[PDB]
Amino acid sequence: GPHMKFTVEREHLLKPLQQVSGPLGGRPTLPILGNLLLQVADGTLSLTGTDLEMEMVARVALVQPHEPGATTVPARKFFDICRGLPEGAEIAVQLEGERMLVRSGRSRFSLSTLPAADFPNLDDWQSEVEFTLPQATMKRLIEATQFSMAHQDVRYYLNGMLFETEGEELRTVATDGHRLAVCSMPIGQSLPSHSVIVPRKGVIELMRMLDGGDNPLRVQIGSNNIRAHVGDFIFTSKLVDGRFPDYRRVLPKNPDKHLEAGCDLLKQAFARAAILSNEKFRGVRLYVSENQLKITANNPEQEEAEEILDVTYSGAEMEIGFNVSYVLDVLNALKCENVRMMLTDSVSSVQIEDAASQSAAYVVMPMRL
Amino acid sequence: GPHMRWYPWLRPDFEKLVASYQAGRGHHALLIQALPGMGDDALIYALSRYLLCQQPQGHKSCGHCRGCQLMQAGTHPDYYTLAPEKGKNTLGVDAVREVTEKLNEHARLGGAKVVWVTDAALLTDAAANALLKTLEEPPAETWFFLATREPERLLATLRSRCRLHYLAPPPEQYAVTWLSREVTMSQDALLAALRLSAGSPGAALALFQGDNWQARETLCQALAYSVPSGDWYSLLAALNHEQAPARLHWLATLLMDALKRHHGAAQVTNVDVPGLVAELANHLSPSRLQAILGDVCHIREQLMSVTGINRELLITDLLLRIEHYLQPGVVLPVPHL
Amino acid sequence: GPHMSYQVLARKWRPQTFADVVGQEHVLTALANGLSLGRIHHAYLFSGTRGVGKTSIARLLAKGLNCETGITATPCGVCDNCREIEQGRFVDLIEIDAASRTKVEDTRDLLDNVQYAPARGRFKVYLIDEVHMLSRHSFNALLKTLEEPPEHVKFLLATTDPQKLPVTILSRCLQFHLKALDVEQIRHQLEHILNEEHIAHEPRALQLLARAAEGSLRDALSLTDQAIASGDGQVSTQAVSAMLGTLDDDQALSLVEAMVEANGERVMALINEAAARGIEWEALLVEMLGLLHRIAMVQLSPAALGNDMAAIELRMRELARTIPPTDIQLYYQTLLIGRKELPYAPDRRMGVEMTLLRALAFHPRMPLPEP
Amino acid sequence: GPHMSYQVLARKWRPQTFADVVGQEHVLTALANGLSLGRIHHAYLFSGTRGVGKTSIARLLAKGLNCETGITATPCGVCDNCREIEQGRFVDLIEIDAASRTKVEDTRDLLDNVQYAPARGRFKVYLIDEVHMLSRHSFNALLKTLEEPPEHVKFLLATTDPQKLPVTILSRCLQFHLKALDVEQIRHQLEHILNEEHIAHEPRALQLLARAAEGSLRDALSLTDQAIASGDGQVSTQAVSAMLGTLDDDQALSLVEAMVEANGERVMALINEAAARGIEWEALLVEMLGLLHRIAMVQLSPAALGNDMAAIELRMRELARTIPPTDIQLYYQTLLIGRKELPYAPDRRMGVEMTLLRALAFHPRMPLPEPEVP
Amino acid sequence: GPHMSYQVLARKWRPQTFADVVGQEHVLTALANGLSLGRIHHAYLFSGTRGVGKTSIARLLAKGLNCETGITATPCGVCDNCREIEQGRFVDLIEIDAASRTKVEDTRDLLDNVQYAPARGRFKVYLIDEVHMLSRHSFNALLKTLEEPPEHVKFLLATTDPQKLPVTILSRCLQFHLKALDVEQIRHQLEHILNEEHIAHEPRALQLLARAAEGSLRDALSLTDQAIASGDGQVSTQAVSAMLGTLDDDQALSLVEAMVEANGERVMALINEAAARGIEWEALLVEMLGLLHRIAMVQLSPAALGNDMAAIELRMRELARTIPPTDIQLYYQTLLIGRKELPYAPDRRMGVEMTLLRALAFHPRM
DNA sequence: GCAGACACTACGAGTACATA
DNA sequence: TTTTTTTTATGTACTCGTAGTGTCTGC
Ligand SMILES: Nc1ncnc2c1ncn2[C@@H]1O[C@H](COP(=O)(O)OP(=O)(O)O)[C@@H](O)[C@H]1O
Ligand SMILES: Nc1ncnc2c1ncn2[C@@H]1O[C@H](COP(=O)(O)OP(=O)(O)O)[C@@H](O)[C@H]1O
Ligand SMILES: Nc1ncnc2c1ncn2[C@@H]1O[C@H](COP(=O)(O)OP(=O)(O)O)[C@@H](O)[C@H]1O
Ligand code: BEF
Ligand code: BEF
Ligand code: BEF
Ligand SMILES: [Mg+2]
Ligand SMILES: [Mg+2]
Ligand SMILES: [Mg+2]
Ligand SMILES: [Zn+2]
Ligand SMILES: [Zn+2]
Ligand SMILES: [Zn+2]
Ligand SMILES: [Zn+2]
């Protein structure tokens, strides 16, 4: 246990500390799960947060004298101490036994630690495949499918989302047994099809790490684990083991009925109609007639809601009852202007797609008709 | 027997099962039937050590690998064990449900997964039924190991699922030699202890190691005092204990030997106590002995089965009913026809 | 490697079409007639003993209901829906181990999700096995759905004890009872399986396995796997007889002769000899009960006695000649109650000793020596 | 008939008007009089056993309350309201499945919307199915609602066991009780069903089905559907008898006679015949026990025998007047002990044979001979 | 609709003056004297069995306390405050369905109005109905309010089980316990109610209706309305007798009475009726066994009657006196054997019939 | 941006009760 | 006058404190 003298600046830490904060504090299930891992090595500071199944470390350059080592420092206390200091104020840290003395000007704080050995880590491994995808593209991949993930469903498959590759295309699939969200985007590199399943929480930290910067997100796909790299930030997590439902088997086989309209108008109309929907089911009935759309909603309070939309439709009239929360989420994800829908039958799955390009697609399974 | 002692009378069966497991011709759910202390725990431990890590030479331990390091330290996460909470006495269905879902969530390390129930007879009905689908269709390379002292007590819907293995008790002479080597006691005491434990050398070793021998000799002295006077109530002082079912079984064994002596059976079970069996034969009629034996067996079963039952009240009632039976002119009970 | 894990016969030989059933013809005829016509129901409850086929029958019913060939009495394995139902991963067939999830919360979530339309399947089949373990709250939750379910929903329930289920649930479903398989059907299925697996067998071993299966085919397959593991890759009469501890000599006959003669010394000497060789006690009591049944029958009809026990016919004839029927009935009753009492007083040896002493008690054991 | 959709008889033939309801004359007359005269109470509780009509009658009352022709005792099938009720899509017939919505929060939600008036209806009906399922807080949340409900809200509760409801709820709501249906009513209803639906049938099979589902009509309908499945789309005596596992009364009494008159060979022959037929042995014991009990009952009074056993009625009498009741007690005890100890016999056939042999040995009149040597 | 207008007998005829409450004389007299002398406790907690007027008497108290003519035992109907009490829309009467507003949030919100003066009444009166179910923290808030109550606020708690209430609230509340109404009072008020309405009635039918209800007036009135509906507008003896036979539940007592008198036809009819009224046969036989046990015990000491048999005492005393102990012991043994033997018998109705026949066979009745 | 506020919803824990 | 005293397994509600999540308001 050598002395640990940090001499750092706020502007170089507050963003890395925020990034490494993540799913820390909150629910402490056991003490040695710990708060942080601070490591001084080769003029770099590695700050590690964990969740007993996840890990992420931020690297901060040490342009000043340092002492290598590894120890812990409380998450909320350190974060708030660093945040509350004057803008640009320096931080000087010393270690005495198991005590951290943090000094800023004339301000002194004492902090308790735990041995670095007691901290739980993840066993190293040999990476299987690796991607270097641009940040904006990865954000587009995640946002198009994040909402559709299941909420603690018994079918563990639905609790995450799948990333797969075919040559130059990367496909992302999410589902919960009622919704399907698939999005395929170009890569620029060709790698074999090694599907991976990432749990919901891990996807949340993947979203948090992304900052829309020029640095491409690197990812190492393993067998039962995942690693990510954004600049100086490293991340790793476990994986859900199994197989996702075949999306091609879920997508409609005979999308004969076609519809096209404006995303904004449909989203606003569905939001208006969902007010009177059943708060426990959120089911709305859709009647498609010649160049006309009709949405009808009812709730146990016996209130009725009707909305009519101008649309282009060349098929036959059809009735179909489906959830309004799902279509609202789909339209929220779909940020373009014009949206197309493919329908087959009154109890057939409905495909939602961008009119500008195929890009990503969605599937909604109707309610009881 | 403190913990997991290898037993020579286990060596044959062991290798046989390995021959089944190594060739990929072993049932996923194997139900071990063995006496208490027969060593089924050691057999299951050795099997799990073979299964759960990198393949060894093909026999013995698994060598010096990550599997052995995690297993010996009890840290391997692919080695699920079902043991009743020490505060409780039975396998809560919540524990089995958690184990089954964790097993459904795929292995963590390389290799197969092993689930071991420390005792099948302690499974409650809900806990027993929570294992039916998992036994019927294990997820992938999942091997179960259930230990029991009698398969009939277990549910019929579970005995169907599991391939049953039988750990036959060792021949009596060999077990006597082994125990005499292990424990320095006279031959008669050794034989009586072995026959008391139905030929289970591990159970006899456990009986000798603890204070059970002192309790048995105290019960013998109390019975010797009580039999001629007819004051059986004093036996309460020796019968009320946490090990009451075992002492009631000892009493039933003494009554069985008394009836044997009345019929003059060439074989007995309390060899080293001829005085007590002679006194019981002399002072008690065969019908009275049979009735007392039936009542004692019934009380032992009621104590062992119904959880939470009060020991003191039952034992006192049994002793008072026996006192009533010893008095002349009292109608004896008969088995429920 | 075709067997990554040991695909035990209880799992490999699961029926895939209606023609693989071992003879549950009474329910199969109803199922085939219902599927052939338009008469289809939304709640089937198959009940019976363990390892009789009701889960397999339910899975076959689901395969027939969802195959894209149509509603066929005989499902086609070529169908993609059948390909997925025979394995896992079918979006429609939702199999719930009721004992695993007895909480009313899971049942309520299931009944919330039942409203949605099926994915690419004619009927969303809910197969709830071991339904008798569900909590009473879940039972009552499963009332209003089973009575007026959506057209695209079919409920298949399986249980080993119909009584434990509330009468209300039984009142809404088609109750099928799967009779325990007879000896001949089990033997024929076992010989067919072993011939298909290229594993040698003997007729006597198969007959013993069928006899000990107690009417359950899963028991027969488990016993066959026991024999395979302990029979060096073949089903042999010696291996199964040794593992079952069955009696080939007249030990039971000599024991009952000594007992009816009220010779306690002989009875206990024979029981000690039986303990020496480790004969299974339950089998001994079963054989004694069977011999007493034969004694009663020959007392009623001597012709009936002519059976496999021909080499020992004279002994049973003498016992029937010398023993009143009432004593035989009392002996049978005592031995039967004793058999009920084996899984009591865990040391089963003294349990059989208790039973034999109770049987001996009826006749006088007086020291009075008379011929 | 013409409907290619083979709707389940338990669903297709749900009562439409008060004329289509069989039995339950008490509740039917009470509701007809309380709806023709007026004075509609604000809470009903239909208490009865399974499959007697605890819900369909509630739906009929709902139809009778808010009908276009006013409050009527004859629910029409012409106006929109009644058909919407039957289709289950009606706006005001809030069908509260109390099994699912059992928590107190859901009951509070239900009580919150009580005053918000009915839409396209004279009354709003809160048909709470299986009220005996609500939690204690849910039970007690609706007390002051039941005691002083709004003038437009009527509760209709339907429970199987009212004893589990708190006593104050039994006080507030009307307590209508539905008796279990009789065998003749069930047979008549099934004859109506299999005449309206073009399915050939035999009266003996209908009687067997009616008796096998005693007290509950939905049980009878399900058994009849399953018998149609078992048979070639027709309810025949052979199909029903084979399906139920029951043994025809004539042959069981033949076995009983062979036991009583100490004819061992006839007993064995009948046992062999039953074995060849595949009838479950425990079912044979059950039928013999039932016949012995019926003999005891007709000894109690000759009126105890209905037309159900009429085919062998004479034989029944010829067994009642020839043997004392003590012999029946002994026979019933022996066969019942045999049934109790059957599961542990070497075989079910062996157990049944041994039980019959014991009844033959121990029966008093002309018992089995004992060995000549003492 | 097209049926004129007919209210419910339970909600109607609710008393509006203290003289219209039938029975419970001690509570009414104590309240009258307390209001006369000006001795009013801070909190009045009513308790008793169902349907004995606890809520109605509490509502009468709330009407009286805010009457403009003054605090009196007989508030007028003249006062507009009294009229608003009638209509249920009174600003100074706060009716809280504590069975619905159990959470501490709503209770605290409604108890934070103690700081505000009454709008048009002398006392801000809280009528917290069904107080027994209430969250523990809501009990804490209520206790904190009652410990230091404003002089212009009086509490009127009502409940069915006072045991569930915490002792800290009981020790601060003047508790009034209401008796179950006597049969004669119930019959008298039933006669008066049926005469005030234009409904014909019969004396024996009225007595049957009064006896059927277990001392609760709401039960009596509910059965009265149900019988009127079933009785074709007339309370006739045969119709109500048949109705109560259909609603008859204490089958086991009649079974015991018929069995001990060796009436084979009567017991057969009774068991047929108990089969039609779908029940559990094991439960019926357990009830019969328990009743026989009680009859055997009562003969040893009358004090065995207790409180449960308050509505059953008359028949049980006769059964205990008229039957020798040996016969009761034999019947108990026969029924115990029958219950042990029941599950293995055929369908349990057959087994119960057989056990009853076994018990009947002992007497020499032919 | 925007983060705090504020709502809102969910989860654990302590308590009460039911059925077997 | 003073202490004396309990049967679990499994499940289902109910209610309050603490935290996690959305979102949007003048900040
Ligand atoms: N009717 C049958 N035909 C063929 N095999 C059967 C039959 N019944 C049972 N089996 C065998 O038993 C095994 C388990 O059958 P299963 O259908 O699960 O019985 P259960 O009704 O108790 O769930 C099957 O894998 C099959 O080998
Ligand atoms: N009294 C009856 N008359 C005619 N059919 C009946 C009667 N009772 C029950 N049924 C049959 O049972 C089906 C469902 O009855 P239901 O009224 O739901 O019983 P429950 O009282 O249990 O809800 C009906 O569709 C009808 O065919
Ligand atoms: N003492 C009584 N005098 C007159 N009617 C009564 C009495 N007690 C109960 N009732 C009748 O019962 C109906 C409901 O009474 P209520 O006082 O609400 O009972 P609870 O004590 O359960 O709240 C009243 O409308 C009234 O008809
Ligand atoms: F083993 Be089976 F499902 F009864
Ligand atoms: F099927 Be009923 F409502 F019990
Ligand atoms: F309104 Be009471 F308490 F039934
Ligand atoms: Mg199964
Ligand atoms: Mg219903
Ligand atoms: Mg009240
Ligand atoms: Zn190893
Ligand atoms: Zn097919
Ligand atoms: Zn109408
Ligand atoms: Zn006034």
Side-chain angles (χ1 to χ4, degrees), chain C residues 39 108 140 144 147 172-173 293 329 333 339, chain D residues 14 95 99 133 197 222 341 344 353-354:
Chain C
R39 190 84 74 187
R108 266 204 267 284
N140 281 329
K144 274 204 57 58
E147 191 201 342
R172 302 158 192 272
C173 316
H293 171 279
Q329 284 305 326
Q333 191 85 17
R339 170 171 188 206
Chain D
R14 182 178 261 89
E95 187 163 2
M133 205 52 218
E197 182 155 342
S222 166
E341 70 185 5
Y344 290 152
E353 280 179 0
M354 175 55 86

mmCIF file of all heavy atoms in Angstrom, chain C residues 39 108 140 144 147 172-173 293 329 333 339, chain D residues 14 95 99 133 197 222 341 344 353-354:
data_model
loop_
_atom_site.group_PDB
_atom_site.id
_atom_site.type_symbol
_atom_site.label_atom_id
_atom_site.label_comp_id
_atom_site.label_asym_id
_atom_site.label_seq_id
_atom_site.Cartn_x
_atom_site.Cartn_y
_atom_site.Cartn_z
ATOM 1 N N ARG C 39 -64.938 -30.588 -35.553
ATOM 2 C CA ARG C 39 -65.163 -30.581 -34.112
ATOM 3 C C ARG C 39 -63.828 -30.421 -33.402
ATOM 4 O O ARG C 39 -63.111 -31.394 -33.167
ATOM 5 C CB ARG C 39 -65.872 -31.858 -33.680
ATOM 6 C CG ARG C 39 -66.362 -31.838 -32.247
ATOM 7 C CD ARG C 39 -67.711 -31.153 -32.134
ATOM 8 N NE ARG C 39 -68.788 -31.987 -32.651
ATOM 9 C CZ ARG C 39 -70.044 -31.586 -32.790
ATOM 10 N NH1 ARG C 39 -70.420 -30.363 -32.456
ATOM 11 N NH2 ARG C 39 -70.944 -32.433 -33.279
ATOM 12 N N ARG C 108 -51.429 -14.384 -14.413
ATOM 13 C CA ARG C 108 -52.080 -13.140 -14.808
ATOM 14 C C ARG C 108 -51.367 -12.491 -15.987
ATOM 15 O O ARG C 108 -52.016 -11.957 -16.892
ATOM 16 C CB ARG C 108 -52.149 -12.186 -13.620
ATOM 17 C CG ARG C 108 -53.449 -12.286 -12.852
ATOM 18 C CD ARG C 108 -53.741 -11.013 -12.087
ATOM 19 N NE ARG C 108 -53.248 -11.073 -10.717
ATOM 20 C CZ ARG C 108 -53.836 -11.750 -9.742
ATOM 21 N NH1 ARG C 108 -54.938 -12.451 -9.952
ATOM 22 N NH2 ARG C 108 -53.308 -11.720 -8.523
ATOM 23 N N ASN C 140 -58.259 -20.133 -10.052
ATOM 24 C CA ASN C 140 -59.418 -19.277 -10.272
ATOM 25 C C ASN C 140 -59.167 -18.265 -11.380
ATOM 26 O O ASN C 140 -60.110 -17.857 -12.065
ATOM 27 C CB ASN C 140 -59.803 -18.561 -8.983
ATOM 28 C CG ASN C 140 -60.583 -19.444 -8.044
ATOM 29 O OD1 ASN C 140 -61.320 -20.327 -8.477
ATOM 30 N ND2 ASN C 140 -60.438 -19.205 -6.748
ATOM 31 N N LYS C 144 -62.276 -17.801 -16.345
ATOM 32 C CA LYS C 144 -63.017 -17.057 -17.352
ATOM 33 C C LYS C 144 -62.386 -17.150 -18.730
ATOM 34 O O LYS C 144 -63.085 -16.957 -19.728
ATOM 35 C CB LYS C 144 -63.151 -15.595 -16.935
ATOM 36 C CG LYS C 144 -64.347 -15.336 -16.038
ATOM 37 C CD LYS C 144 -64.795 -13.892 -16.124
ATOM 38 C CE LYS C 144 -65.114 -13.498 -17.554
ATOM 39 N NZ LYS C 144 -66.167 -14.364 -18.148
ATOM 40 N N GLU C 147 -63.400 -20.649 -20.503
ATOM 41 C CA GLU C 147 -64.808 -20.788 -20.847
ATOM 42 C C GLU C 147 -65.158 -20.092 -22.155
ATOM 43 O O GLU C 147 -65.899 -20.651 -22.969
ATOM 44 C CB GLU C 147 -65.679 -20.243 -19.719
ATOM 45 C CG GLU C 147 -67.143 -20.581 -19.859
ATOM 46 C CD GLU C 147 -68.020 -19.651 -19.056
ATOM 47 O OE1 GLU C 147 -67.493 -18.984 -18.139
ATOM 48 O OE2 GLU C 147 -69.233 -19.582 -19.342
ATOM 49 N N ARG C 172 -64.750 -27.490 -17.362
ATOM 50 C CA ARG C 172 -64.660 -26.698 -18.581
ATOM 51 C C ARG C 172 -63.850 -27.359 -19.685
ATOM 52 O O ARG C 172 -63.761 -26.798 -20.780
ATOM 53 C CB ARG C 172 -64.058 -25.322 -18.274
ATOM 54 C CG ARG C 172 -64.826 -24.514 -17.254
ATOM 55 C CD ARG C 172 -63.944 -23.457 -16.619
ATOM 56 N NE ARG C 172 -64.574 -22.861 -15.450
ATOM 57 C CZ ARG C 172 -65.387 -21.817 -15.493
ATOM 58 N NH1 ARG C 172 -65.667 -21.209 -16.632
ATOM 59 N NH2 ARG C 172 -65.935 -21.372 -14.367
ATOM 60 N N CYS C 173 -63.272 -28.531 -19.443
ATOM 61 C CA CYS C 173 -62.342 -29.139 -20.382
ATOM 62 C C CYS C 173 -62.794 -30.545 -20.761
ATOM 63 O O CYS C 173 -63.641 -31.153 -20.100
ATOM 64 C CB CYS C 173 -60.934 -29.196 -19.789
ATOM 65 S SG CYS C 173 -60.404 -27.692 -18.962
ATOM 66 N N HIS C 293 -52.425 -65.452 -3.255
ATOM 67 C CA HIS C 293 -53.531 -65.318 -4.195
ATOM 68 C C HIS C 293 -53.748 -66.612 -4.965
ATOM 69 O O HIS C 293 -54.889 -67.053 -5.155
ATOM 70 C CB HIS C 293 -53.261 -64.162 -5.155
ATOM 71 C CG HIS C 293 -54.232 -64.081 -6.291
ATOM 72 N ND1 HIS C 293 -54.126 -64.867 -7.417
ATOM 73 C CD2 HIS C 293 -55.326 -63.306 -6.475
ATOM 74 C CE1 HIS C 293 -55.117 -64.583 -8.244
ATOM 75 N NE2 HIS C 293 -55.857 -63.637 -7.697
ATOM 76 N N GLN C 329 -56.725 -65.612 3.926
ATOM 77 C CA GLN C 329 -57.151 -64.224 3.788
ATOM 78 C C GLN C 329 -56.506 -63.339 4.844
ATOM 79 O O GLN C 329 -56.070 -62.221 4.545
ATOM 80 C CB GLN C 329 -58.672 -64.133 3.868
ATOM 81 C CG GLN C 329 -59.367 -64.592 2.608
ATOM 82 C CD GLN C 329 -58.880 -63.851 1.384
ATOM 83 O OE1 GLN C 329 -58.550 -62.668 1.452
ATOM 84 N NE2 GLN C 329 -58.829 -64.544 0.255
ATOM 85 N N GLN C 333 -53.994 -60.220 4.113
ATOM 86 C CA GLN C 333 -54.252 -58.885 4.641
ATOM 87 C C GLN C 333 -53.074 -58.373 5.456
ATOM 88 O O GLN C 333 -52.673 -57.209 5.321
ATOM 89 C CB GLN C 333 -55.520 -58.894 5.488
ATOM 90 C CG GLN C 333 -56.003 -57.515 5.861
ATOM 91 C CD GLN C 333 -56.860 -56.904 4.780
ATOM 92 O OE1 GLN C 333 -57.347 -57.603 3.892
ATOM 93 N NE2 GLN C 333 -57.045 -55.591 4.841
ATOM 94 N N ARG C 339 -46.751 -54.514 3.460
ATOM 95 C CA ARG C 339 -46.206 -53.917 2.248
ATOM 96 C C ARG C 339 -46.498 -52.427 2.207
ATOM 97 O O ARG C 339 -45.650 -51.627 1.793
ATOM 98 C CB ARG C 339 -46.765 -54.599 1.003
ATOM 99 C CG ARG C 339 -46.405 -53.851 -0.263
ATOM 100 C CD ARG C 339 -46.745 -54.609 -1.524
ATOM 101 N NE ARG C 339 -46.204 -53.920 -2.687
ATOM 102 C CZ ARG C 339 -46.700 -54.007 -3.912
ATOM 103 N NH1 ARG C 339 -47.756 -54.756 -4.177
ATOM 104 N NH2 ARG C 339 -46.119 -53.331 -4.897
ATOM 105 N N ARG D 14 -75.373 -21.453 -25.049
ATOM 106 C CA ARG D 14 -75.599 -20.646 -23.863
ATOM 107 C C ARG D 14 -77.006 -20.058 -23.915
ATOM 108 O O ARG D 14 -77.462 -19.642 -24.986
ATOM 109 C CB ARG D 14 -74.560 -19.530 -23.775
ATOM 110 C CG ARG D 14 -74.684 -18.655 -22.557
ATOM 111 C CD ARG D 14 -73.593 -17.608 -22.525
ATOM 112 N NE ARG D 14 -72.502 -17.993 -21.642
ATOM 113 C CZ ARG D 14 -71.451 -18.702 -22.022
ATOM 114 N NH1 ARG D 14 -71.315 -19.119 -23.268
ATOM 115 N NH2 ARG D 14 -70.512 -18.999 -21.130
ATOM 116 N N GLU D 95 -67.710 -6.502 -17.430
ATOM 117 C CA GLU D 95 -67.526 -7.850 -16.903
ATOM 118 C C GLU D 95 -66.218 -7.878 -16.129
ATOM 119 O O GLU D 95 -65.142 -8.019 -16.711
ATOM 120 C CB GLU D 95 -67.537 -8.875 -18.028
ATOM 121 C CG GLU D 95 -67.512 -10.309 -17.543
ATOM 122 C CD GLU D 95 -67.942 -11.286 -18.613
ATOM 123 O OE1 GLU D 95 -68.232 -10.839 -19.742
ATOM 124 O OE2 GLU D 95 -68.001 -12.499 -18.325
ATOM 125 N N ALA D 99 -61.098 -12.648 -10.580
ATOM 126 C CA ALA D 99 -59.887 -13.438 -10.402
ATOM 127 C C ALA D 99 -58.652 -12.661 -10.839
ATOM 128 O O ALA D 99 -57.613 -12.707 -10.171
ATOM 129 C CB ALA D 99 -60.000 -14.749 -11.172
ATOM 130 N N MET D 133 -63.151 -14.439 -4.950
ATOM 131 C CA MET D 133 -61.731 -14.398 -5.242
ATOM 132 C C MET D 133 -61.060 -13.108 -4.797
ATOM 133 O O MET D 133 -59.832 -13.078 -4.682
ATOM 134 C CB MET D 133 -61.509 -14.587 -6.743
ATOM 135 C CG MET D 133 -60.157 -15.138 -7.060
ATOM 136 S SD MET D 133 -59.908 -16.608 -6.060
ATOM 137 C CE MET D 133 -58.185 -16.417 -5.666
ATOM 138 N N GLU D 197 -78.957 -30.091 -33.016
ATOM 139 C CA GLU D 197 -77.773 -30.424 -33.790
ATOM 140 C C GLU D 197 -77.941 -31.831 -34.345
ATOM 141 O O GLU D 197 -78.185 -32.775 -33.588
ATOM 142 C CB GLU D 197 -76.518 -30.324 -32.927
ATOM 143 C CG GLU D 197 -75.232 -30.603 -33.673
ATOM 144 C CD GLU D 197 -74.036 -29.945 -33.022
ATOM 145 O OE1 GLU D 197 -74.239 -29.009 -32.222
ATOM 146 O OE2 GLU D 197 -72.894 -30.362 -33.308
ATOM 147 N N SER D 222 -69.701 -30.996 -21.865
ATOM 148 C CA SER D 222 -68.327 -31.355 -22.200
ATOM 149 C C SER D 222 -68.188 -32.854 -22.428
ATOM 150 O O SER D 222 -67.523 -33.287 -23.377
ATOM 151 C CB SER D 222 -67.379 -30.893 -21.097
ATOM 152 O OG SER D 222 -66.110 -31.505 -21.231
ATOM 153 N N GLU D 341 -57.057 -51.269 -0.176
ATOM 154 C CA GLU D 341 -55.778 -51.966 -0.217
ATOM 155 C C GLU D 341 -55.376 -52.412 -1.617
ATOM 156 O O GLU D 341 -54.330 -53.047 -1.768
ATOM 157 C CB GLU D 341 -55.816 -53.176 0.715
ATOM 158 C CG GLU D 341 -56.709 -54.299 0.231
ATOM 159 C CD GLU D 341 -56.804 -55.427 1.236
ATOM 160 O OE1 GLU D 341 -56.246 -55.280 2.342
ATOM 161 O OE2 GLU D 341 -57.432 -56.460 0.922
ATOM 162 N N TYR D 344 -51.702 -51.613 -3.464
ATOM 163 C CA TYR D 344 -50.511 -52.303 -2.991
ATOM 164 C C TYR D 344 -50.566 -53.805 -3.229
ATOM 165 O O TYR D 344 -49.660 -54.524 -2.802
ATOM 166 C CB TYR D 344 -50.293 -51.995 -1.512
ATOM 167 C CG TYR D 344 -49.882 -50.564 -1.282
ATOM 168 C CD1 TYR D 344 -50.184 -49.914 -0.097
ATOM 169 C CD2 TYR D 344 -49.209 -49.855 -2.268
ATOM 170 C CE1 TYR D 344 -49.811 -48.601 0.106
ATOM 171 C CE2 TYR D 344 -48.829 -48.545 -2.073
ATOM 172 C CZ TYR D 344 -49.133 -47.921 -0.885
ATOM 173 O OH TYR D 344 -48.758 -46.612 -0.689
ATOM 174 N N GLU D 353 -59.375 -59.845 -7.618
ATOM 175 C CA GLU D 353 -59.706 -61.252 -7.446
ATOM 176 C C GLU D 353 -59.603 -61.664 -5.986
ATOM 177 O O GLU D 353 -60.475 -62.371 -5.473
ATOM 178 C CB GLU D 353 -58.801 -62.118 -8.319
ATOM 179 C CG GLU D 353 -59.230 -62.168 -9.773
ATOM 180 C CD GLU D 353 -58.301 -63.001 -10.625
ATOM 181 O OE1 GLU D 353 -57.322 -63.546 -10.077
ATOM 182 O OE2 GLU D 353 -58.551 -63.113 -11.843
ATOM 183 N N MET D 354 -58.554 -61.222 -5.293
ATOM 184 C CA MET D 354 -58.407 -61.581 -3.888
ATOM 185 C C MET D 354 -59.512 -60.969 -3.041
ATOM 186 O O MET D 354 -59.999 -61.604 -2.102
ATOM 187 C CB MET D 354 -57.037 -61.153 -3.373
ATOM 188 C CG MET D 354 -56.864 -61.381 -1.887
ATOM 189 S SD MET D 354 -57.201 -63.088 -1.425
ATOM 190 C CE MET D 354 -55.605 -63.835 -1.721
#
